[PDB]
Amino acid sequence: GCCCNPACGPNYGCGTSCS
Numbered sequence: 001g002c003c004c005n006p007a008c009g010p011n012y013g014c015g016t017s018c019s
Contacts (some may be wrong), residue, residue: 001018001019002014002018002019003017005017
Protein backbone atom coordinates (compact mmCIF):
# COMPACT_ATOMS: atom_id res chain seq x y z
CA GLY A 1 0.00 0.00 0.00
CA CYS A 2 1.72 3.13 1.29
CA CYS A 3 5.50 3.31 0.90
CA CYS A 4 7.53 3.06 4.11
CA ASN A 5 11.02 1.84 3.21
CA PRO A 6 13.70 4.23 1.90
CA ALA A 7 14.29 2.16 -1.23
CA CYS A 8 10.87 3.34 -2.42
CA GLY A 9 12.23 6.87 -2.70
CA PRO A 10 13.39 10.03 -0.90
CA ASN A 11 10.17 10.24 1.12
CA TYR A 12 7.66 7.58 2.14
CA GLY A 13 5.78 9.13 5.04
CA CYS A 14 4.63 5.76 6.37
CA GLY A 15 1.37 6.14 8.27
CA THR A 16 0.02 4.14 11.19
CA SER A 17 -3.25 3.44 9.39
CA CYS A 18 -1.49 2.72 6.09
CA SER A 19 1.45 0.68 7.37
